Each structure stands twice: as C-alpha cells, then as structure tokens.
From Swiss-Prot:
Protein name: Poly(ethylene terephthalate) hydrolase
Organism encoding this protein: Piscinibacter sakaiensis
Family the UniProt entry places it in: Belongs to the AB hydrolase superfamily.
Variant or mutagenesis effect after changing C210A: Displays decreased enzymatic activity on PET film and on BHET
Outcome after substituting S64M: Increases activity towards 1-naphthyl butyrate
Biotechnology: Has potential for application in environmental remediation and biological recycling of PET and PEF waste products.
C-alpha cells in the first residue's frame, strides 16, 4: 500500500524552497471547532494527497508556522495551518482543534464548491505544531494511532510520557531552547517512545523559534519534514534514506533515530 507521487527525490529537490507542484491557498469560511485556518493545496499532484494539520504555540498564530504550508503542499499534501479558539489554549485543547481541522479538511474534500474537492485521501493524515502545538500533535498521535506521521517542533506538554505512541514521530528540537528546554521537554518526550519509528533532530544553537517562519535552516528542516511525511504518510520507500539518514550537517547539534530503516 504505497501512494508515490512526483519525481524521484534528490537532496537538491528536497532542500529547494519549492517542491514540484504548484500551490494555491484559501481561508476557511466557517471554521468548525478551531479559530481560523488557511488551506494550502497542490493544483497538479496527479492523485489524492494526505492532509497535515499544523498548530502554533501559546500566544502564537498561523504566522509562526505558515512556512510549512507551501513547503509541504508543493511536495503533494493538503496542509491546514490553524489559529486556536484562544491564543491561551493548553495542549489538550490544541490537540482537539488540530483533529477538528483534519475533520473539516475531510468535509471540504467532499464539498464541490471547495478548491480541495476530491484532492484529499482522508485515510492518510499527519500532525505538526510548535511548543504547546507540538505537545498537542503528540496527544493527537496518542489518541488517534491511525495518523500516519507526527513532526512537532520544540514540543512541550505537562507530561513527557508518550510511551503509547505507535505513529512515526520526528521531533525538531532547538539546542538553546530556554522556553521548553530540550533536557526537560523534547528529549524526555523522544525517550518515552519505544513502539514507533522516531527521530530527534536538534538545531545547533537554536532558540525556541528555530523551526518557525523566518528560520535560517529551511533547506535542512524542510528536507527532513517533507522526507518524513513522504516516507510515512505515502509509504514512499524512495524517501527511506532522506527520512532515516543522519543529514551530516554542522547545523545539527544532535541526531537520534530508531525503527527507521534505510
């Protein structure tokens, strides 16, 4: 069961600002169970694509995470970036809202007026987000083991115990994070997970915002996010090396992976 779309990947094609597909976007008119959303979609993927829902951190909005929308969509995904009902929502609420966004993407896939009408494989879904939105993504993964992939950034949750998670999980960490320190947040979360394909990618000298819109490492972070989603959401074994490899970069202060075959 593989859903291979687009050309055979290269380090160069994955590091580029844009993948092979053309991207359009729209604002969701009547968000159902979350604050606001922007839907990014490929116009020319040549098949139905998985959907990814991305949630910001505490006080934050779509702007903090929006760079992911076109970057992932241009490689063959429908991506929804959300605002939460309140900027002060906690991780459980962020998880519910993330899953509501995926539910509404599935709804719009069935809506003839929608730009994403018949563009989505509602069986193939993924979750991403920053800090409390990253914690929320891991809660979404724990509660919904049918999700194909999770790739949270600088995650925080009130508990680091994600031992039940079977969903392939890529944690982006920021070496010098002083909001959700790696030693008390990202790494204990990574270490809790014994049942899944998982990866830990720490950005050298990174602050808490090291994977956000306007980061200086979009070539590397974008390559790893896309490769992880292509490998696990599409079961596209063309991406096994890109997903599972140590990227061998002086921008990476720490790399860990498990159950991830090249």
């Amino acid at each position: 069961g593989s859903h291979m779309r687009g050309p055979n990947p290269t380090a160069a094609s994955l590091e580029a600002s844009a993948g092979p597909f053309t991207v359009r976007s729209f604002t969701v008119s009547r968000p159902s169970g979350y604050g606001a959303g922007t839907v990014y979609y490929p116009t020319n993927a040549g098949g139905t694509v998985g959907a990814i829902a991305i949630v910001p951190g505490y006080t934050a909005r779509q702007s903090s995470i929006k760079w992911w929308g076109p970057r992932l969509a241009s490689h063959g995904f429908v991506v929804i970036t959300i605002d939460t009902n309140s900027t002060l929502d906690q991780p459980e609420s962020r998880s519910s809202q993330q899953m509501a966004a995926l539910r509404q993407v599935a709804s719009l896939n069935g809506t003839s007026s929608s730009p994403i009408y018949g563009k989505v494989d509602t069986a193939r879904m993924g979750v991403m987000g920053w800090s409390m939105g990253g914690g929320g993504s891991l809660i979404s993964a724990a509660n919904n083991p049918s999700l194909k992939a999770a790739a949270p950034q600088a995650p925080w949750h009130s508990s680091t115990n994600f031992s039940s998670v079977t969903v392939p999980t890529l944690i982006f960490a920021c070496e010098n994070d002083s909001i959700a320190p790696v030693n008390s947040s990202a790494l204990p979360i990574y270490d809790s997970m014994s049942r899944n394909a998982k990866q830990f990618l720490e950005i050298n000298g990174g602050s808490h915002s090291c994977a956000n819109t306007g980061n200086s490492d979009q070539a590397l972070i974008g390559k790893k996010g896309v490769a992880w989603m292509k490998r696990f959401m599409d079961n596209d074994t063309r991406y096994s090396t890109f997903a599972c490899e140590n990227p061998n970069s002086t921008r990476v202060s720490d790399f860990r992976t498990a159950n991830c075959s090249l």
